[PDB]
Design a binder for this molecule. Structure first.
Ligand SMILES: [Cl-]
Ligand SMILES: [Cl-]
Ligand SMILES: [Zn+2]
Ligand SMILES: [Zn+2]
Lengths: 30, 21, 30, 21, 30, 21, 30, 21, 30, 21, 30, 21
């Protein structure tokens, strides 16, 4: 059940290209 | 959260834009 | 600069692995 | 910032962790 | 789950490596 | 299509090369 | 040579995110 | 070429969108 | 199986970052 | 192996440090 | 070193793809 | 080693195959 773990590494790199200089925040569940 | 909303279905750029500062 | 931008893309994937469940805020220009 | 510290030299897993939330 | 979508971003890096100078075409339809 | 041929069974390097220009 | 090659690797991933359903043609020398 | 235009200076997404089908 | 195939490629990037100077060995067939 | 162990559950960095020669 | 350290990251991904079931060893310097 | 052959000039897939086990 490593599916979501592998998906979050792709989220972080899509977030990086979308937001840019703006930066982003990555909070898995807190 | 981001994982439950975007790992369940494909978020678009607009919805990903929600997480930029 | 493309060089620093590409380094940042590798920096966020390293933060993903190290920080885990805590997550992180990504800030490019302090 | 995180850029100045780690794209100018290799940061270890231990100094990357300072940037964790 | 977004399994096909994640597979696709892996296919695009593999094609970049394989194809080199020639380039490739990526069309997900259907 | 490429998704149909390579996302259930692994495509070898030679099958991938059919999608080169 | 290698830094334009490394940059193309990231370019193809950004095209995959932006073009979604449309797809794209990737040609370095054209 | 996209390489000449974007491996030099950072191309935004909407500039990269001109290369889609 | 593609699922274990994509998982491995994330494992080798994780080994690269954690092993550092020491390097690693990737023998899938165990 | 590492696949059967780290692809069925999330290996931590301490668990991965074990495959470093 | 940074530029070489980033290139190493791409090298290990190209190896995983090229080598398949044989596996590989990554020893930046032994 | 691999770093100074392949990070200085681009190695083709055939050259990369020299480091497989
Ligand atoms: Cl890079
Ligand atoms: Cl994946
Ligand atoms: Zn890179
Ligand atoms: Zn993946």
């Amino acid at each position: 059940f490593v599916n979501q773990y592998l998906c979050g590494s792709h989220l972080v790199e899509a977030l990086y290209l979308v937001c840019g200089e703006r930066g982003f925040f990555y909070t898995p569940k807190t | 959260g981001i994982v439950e909303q975007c790992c369940t279905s494909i978020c678009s750029l607009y919805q990903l834009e929600n997480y930029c500062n």
